[PDB]
Amino acid sequence: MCDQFVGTWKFLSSENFEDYMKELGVGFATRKMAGVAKPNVTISINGDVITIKTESTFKNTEVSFRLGEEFDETTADDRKTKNVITLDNGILNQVQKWDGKETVIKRKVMDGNLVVECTMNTVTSKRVYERA
Secondary structure, eight states: OOOOSOEEEEEEEEESHHHHHHHHTOOTTHHHHHHHOOOEEEEEEETTEEEEEEESSSSOEEEEEETTOOEEEEOTTSOEEEEEEEEETTEEEEEEEETTEEEEEEEEEETTEEEEEEEETTEEEEEEEEEO
16 A cells, blocks of 8 residues: 555665765765665654654764754764755655765655665666565
């Protein structure tokens, strides 16, 4: 019926993740630990406030936001970013901006799988997660 964002998702696979993180400017070596982790992402909703909590990784993070409203995030690679997330037809669209640069992270639920497609400049990278 509806499998939607809320709940807990376990890494399954990734594609092109290395060239994306290079495009972002992630340092050689942070790129390494990022490619061995199998992160667990929990999406939780409290009223009109979404929380995306990333665990089982090298550096755990938690971001809480309201749709359409701009917020700050210091990312697990030390970027200091401004973000706006919107929702259109079941896809969360995050626009992440630091230094005249920008990345777009799209999240969509497809049949108990969460597909996160990240795009910067030329480069796109897909990560798939399985519902826990």
